[PDB]
Amino acid sequence: KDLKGLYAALLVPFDENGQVNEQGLKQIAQNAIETEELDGLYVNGSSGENFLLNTEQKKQVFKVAKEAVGDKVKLIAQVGSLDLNEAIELGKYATELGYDALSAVTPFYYPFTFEEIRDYYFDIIEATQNNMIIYSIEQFSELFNHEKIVGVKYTAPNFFLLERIRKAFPDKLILSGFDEMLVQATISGVDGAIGSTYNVNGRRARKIFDLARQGQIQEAYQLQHDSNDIIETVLSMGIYPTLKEILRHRGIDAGLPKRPFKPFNEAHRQTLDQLIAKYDL
Amino acid sequence: MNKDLKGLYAALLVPFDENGQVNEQGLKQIAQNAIETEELDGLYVNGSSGENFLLNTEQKKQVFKVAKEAVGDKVKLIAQVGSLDLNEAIELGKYATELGYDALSAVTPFYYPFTFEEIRDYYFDIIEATQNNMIIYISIEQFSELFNHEKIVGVKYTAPNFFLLERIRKAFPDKLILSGFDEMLVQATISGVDGAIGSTYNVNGRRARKIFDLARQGQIQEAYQLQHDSNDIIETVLSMGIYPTLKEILRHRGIDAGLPKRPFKPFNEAHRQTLDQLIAKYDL
Amino acid sequence: NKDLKGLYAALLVPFDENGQVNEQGLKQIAQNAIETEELDGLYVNGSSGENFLLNTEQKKQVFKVAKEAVGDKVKLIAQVGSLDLNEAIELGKYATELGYDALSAVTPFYYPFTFEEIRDYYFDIIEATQNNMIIYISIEQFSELFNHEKIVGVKYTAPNFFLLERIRKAFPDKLILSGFDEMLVQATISGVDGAIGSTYNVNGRRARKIFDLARQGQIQEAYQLQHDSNDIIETVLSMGIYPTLKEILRHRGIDAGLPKRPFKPFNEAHRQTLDQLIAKYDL
Amino acid sequence: NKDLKGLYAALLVPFDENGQVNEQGLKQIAQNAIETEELDGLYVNGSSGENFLLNTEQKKQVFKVAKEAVGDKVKLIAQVGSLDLNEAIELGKYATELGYDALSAVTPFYYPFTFEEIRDYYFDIIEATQNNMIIYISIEQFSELFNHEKIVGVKYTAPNFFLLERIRKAFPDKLILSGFDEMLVQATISGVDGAIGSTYNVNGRRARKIFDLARQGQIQEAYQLQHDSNDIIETVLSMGIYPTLKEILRHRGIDAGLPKRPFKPFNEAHRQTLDQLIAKYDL
Ligand SMILES: [Cl-]
Ligand SMILES: [Cl-]
Ligand SMILES: [Cl-]
Ligand SMILES: [Cl-]
């Protein structure tokens, strides 16, 4: 699979004890593809509350998400972990399930050197033999020299650096991670995008992407205005519980956020009701 | 009428002699280069790019006078008069206004942690004393309060944040927005800016105008290709010392581009070959 | 109940080439801290132990080995913080059952958690474990955390001596343990109750003198020992702090193993400079 | 040639409604610093003096008045830094001609100047004035700056006590004056030669006691005085430091005038809390 296109960053529903609700998760995954008409799912990224999960729950998410959608759906498995043994084990498990590529967040918390960051990606690639999507221009170059590093999920909203990476690496995949600047990413030549709000707003996101590349820039930007009202509202109410409340409105068992995230605050119910009416969410 | 000042502006560079005095003939050549050669809509005079904050009050007036004399009546003129000395800001604002500059602008008061009310009344005091239109440099609720002033016509927007820019464009459809980041002109353009102010348009304003025009005509691919070209230029000049290097490019065209004012140091000759290579490649 | 004041080694962990805990060396490292470095306690599974690189089973393994290594009088604090609250609760219960004197938990990180989220993360761990807790934010918020009788103190790592003085003043009944070895003398005169540090694994004798001399008002001599300690700290930082501390320990005949990847091993290009440091300061 | 050790008031300036210096109030403020606060010297035309808001003639005016207000024993440091280097040299010569013991200059700001540009700005002022200079940057770059015979020290304002300790150790013979009032006690035990502060205009007596007691090793008493000083500092920062400090002086019968716009005057809604602090601390 060419990995171009638009991906929902897959949300995960939990019960009160922080266990995955598998029925709700299957429904969320199918919502992304069938209702929001997206190209694929980005599984166990930050938007999935991945970093709050134990290893067996991560595996549980990968399997459920894979068995919920058809064979033509593009699937990217985020497997980064500060525990490299865990990253490799998740990488092998996702590869065996048939995920089209892995990705891995930059090793964090500790001040890792670039050399340490580089060999963390190279070690995961070596053990899994799958394609890898990563998260400075001389450094990018050394990462992207690797033929199995097919791309970057670019989340730093610096359009100068984006433009430099675009031109420097015309043949690698660039997927942007900032929903609220989709139209700017699009005219900057990204090959697609990954976003949490595409779970509820993937149809507008598609129009933004398509229309911007078709020269219809005013129309794409108007839809960005509309999408940015939604994104701003959802951010102000607590992004992941509120996205899942919007889904729950659709009859989906969207459950609860995993503690220490708190549930949607009902003080926001009226404003959320107004948003959902305004934009037909 | 808030949109009268739309368009593309050179942030006017200033040549100095060895004692940090304005070279007036070189300044006239720079102003004329921006309008006649680079084909820009106007000059932004005494901003950061003119080393404004290194100047005494007399030198600022001198630059305002010469820039204005150098251009025809149809060329748009914006006078940056911000200063931590509010008395000086008012003096320069009155002076620039009597000269016939079409608006004033003023950088956000800096150095000290000023409160928003102090920043607000800094602008309100300049406006009250000069009665000219004002362009500002802060949340959306804070923008709303500043833009409720009939004489605050718009903003020169330099924050690298396209979420806030979009929010501002949506919230203030009839205010002037001019972007100040040359390396993101194409993104600013599709985000609905009414124009741009740039130091690199002194040497690259023809590409800048094509980027602006092609992007608004939806020729997005061709606009973006010109942004790649411009960004090679911008990245190169930033790496050599922006103001001195821009002036060296101007010197190549036969302009009396002089020196930067200390404590900026002159163009370092170790960069000479890399610069000549850039000038040849992009025909600068 | 033990008094928790005093000086603690942040316990380092030796690994084999597969990132598995070396139980033999871990025991030697724990015993070095108490018996050679003369420290009051161990701070187990903190950042310095490469805790955030471990799986749950390995964290329990380290808790168990450290406890087994030390006498009944040794103070033991178990860092159980995790982005996975279920894991943090489970490690908290396990360490309490081992008999650890207090738990601590890093601030939930990575995500932009609200304060109420952070507060209730601490309160949740407490309800489940019933152990005393040490936290890692304005004075107004500290008040809300310290209001809890089971939040007994703070391991204070932010390099800001104005916030430190305010917290000391406002909360005279709470334990403050500073985590910046290179500013021990400044923390001591600011009234901290003790300190936790990774370099006390190799420089614990000098740290005790800094602490004691400074409280006794012999400030000039404490500050000279801070100069000497900071030569060591700067050097060790410039070489990769965790691998280098463990190299110094190896020199005393401890099986200090390897760091866990993605941390890289001690670069041998540093060996001569490290040999010199060990000679100069008799480490 | 005066030694420059000790405690300096960062001289506050009173203005009228048009932003002109109230010269009579300025003398009162200079004299209060030396005669009531019992301070060693005055730091003139720094940030606390609203210096960067002034025109050249006003800066000269402030230098002249402050000098004439104090006796021959008083140490005087003239801050002459400006983004206009021609103005800085002019001010440098003027202050030198009036007999200021040293010059100082803030780090060139606003633009992103290279270290080579910052270095040559200092070197240029020194070369035109021939006076001693205090600077405001890594250790290697400090080593290059301090290699100049006429760079005699540094007004150290970065709240970083690891770098302070490194500088103190690497430059045993240079003058280090700290600029953080709220951390005077930590600076003192770190071996600073003295301190410059705006709050010493109203609290120099406590400041001196903190400085002397800490150096005499009565660290518990010095720390308590810092608790009281930080109460004051935390309150006046919360109300707008410059205007509030001057309001405290007005209360002493001093003509404290107004701040220069765009600073706003003291807001009367803080009156109650201020009166209460002045009461508690006898200011
Ligand atoms: Cl994600
Ligand atoms: Cl400018
Ligand atoms: Cl630790
Ligand atoms: Cl000052």
Author numbering:
A (entry chain D): 3 to 137, 148 to 293
B (entry chain B): 1 to 137, 147 to 293
C (entry chain A), D (entry chain C): 2 to 137, 147 to 293
Task: Show passages lifted from the paper.
NAL catalyses the reversible aldol condensation of N-acetylmannosamine with pyruvate to yield the sialic acid, N-acetylneuraminic acid (Neu5Ac). NAL is a class I aldolase, functioning through the formation of an enzyme–pyruvate Schiff base formed with Lys165 which carries out a nucleophilic attack on the aldehyde carbon of the open-chain form of the N-acetylmannosamine. Here, using the NAL from Staphylococcus aureus, we demonstrate quantitative conversion of a cysteine residue, site-specifically into the nonproteogenic amino acid γ-thialysine, chosen as a mimic of the natural catalytic lysine residue at position 165, using the double alkylation-elimination method and that high yields of an active, modified NAL can be purified. We then characterise the resulting enzyme activity, analyse the pH-dependency of catalysis and use X-ray crystallography to investigate the structural basis of the changes brought about by modifying the enzyme.
The 3D structure of the K165-γ-thialysine enzyme was solved at 2 Å resolution. Subsequent replacement with γ-thialysine side chains correctly accounted for this density in the Fobs−Fcalcd map and showed the presence of γ-thialysine in all four subunits of the enzyme. Alignment of all of the Cα atoms of the K165-γ-thialysine structure with the wild-type structure resulted in an RMSD value of only 0.13 Å. Interestingly, the crystal structure of modified enzyme showed no evidence of d-thialysine at position 165. However the presence of the sulfur atom in the γ-thialysine side chain alters both the bond lengths around the gamma atom of the residue and the bond angles of the side chain. The average Cβ–Sγ and Sγ–Cδ bond lengths in the four γ-thialysines in the tetramer are 1.8 Å and the Cβ–Sγ–Cδ bond angle is 97.2° (compared with 1.82 Å, 1.81 Å and 102.9° in free γ-thialysine). These changes result in the overall “length” of the residue at position 165 (as measured by the Cα-NZ distance) increasing from 6.1 Å for Lys165 to 6.4 Å for γ-thialysine-165.
